[PDB]
Ligand binder design. Sequence first.
Ligand code: RET
Length: 265
Amino acid sequence: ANFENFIGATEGFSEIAYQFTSHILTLGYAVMLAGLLYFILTIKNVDKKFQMSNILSAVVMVSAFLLLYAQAQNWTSSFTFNEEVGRYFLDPSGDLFNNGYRYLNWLIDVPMLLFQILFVVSLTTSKFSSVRNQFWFSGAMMIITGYIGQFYEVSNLTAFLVWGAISSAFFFHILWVMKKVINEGKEGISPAGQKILSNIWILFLISWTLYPGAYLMPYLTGVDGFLYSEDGVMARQLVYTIADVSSKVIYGVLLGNLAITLSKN
Ligand SMILES: *C\C=C(C)/C=C/C=C(C)/C=C/C1=C(C)CCCC1(C)C
């Protein structure tokens, strides 16, 4: 199937690759539940006019909590310890590790995260429905072609890369539209608000680039290097979790800070 199962069937997992990776994925859904509460309780602090951004954050938190909970559980129960050999191995009496929970969660989140900035900032010369449509279309293709090529991770590498590139194309379109949004949204807001918009742009830039980095990570040091081990598994799932916290939680915190700042009139 995927590179995690491959390693879990050929080599196996040490006790600290398995446990660390169970612990990092558990932290990841724990944060989403703490986010959920943060976004509900804070709705009171922003004018009715920006509150839709909180609403959307809350819904993203709900979706990610549940699906990343499934992903966590799909990791713990996929491997079992062989006390003879001392490593954790893929369990044939199991469901086998599956990235589908995470990809599904991106597909749901991607329109809400992109749409929500458009309730905090104003466009100038661009049309609202035009930005929305471009966002929703290319965000969905990006995740789907990201998902297709992920089935060929271990089997066919050339496909894994060509599909991953097809998914980069859509990714970069999104970065174009977002940069445009952020420029127009800077016009006629305060210097404080403009500061926060610039922070949002950099956080959105780093955090979303982590994801194709995590896609490639097992092959980053070549088809026989350091990362082509259970360490690319640890690194891949550490990067995904950082990217989930940054693109979903931190992003919407910054947007809520931008909204409050915009109630200074
Ligand atoms: C959790 C919320 C969101 C919006 C997740 C976004 C994920 C990405 C931007 C993933 C992008 C990919 C790219 C650019 C190319 C390889 C395949 C990926 C799906 C990992």
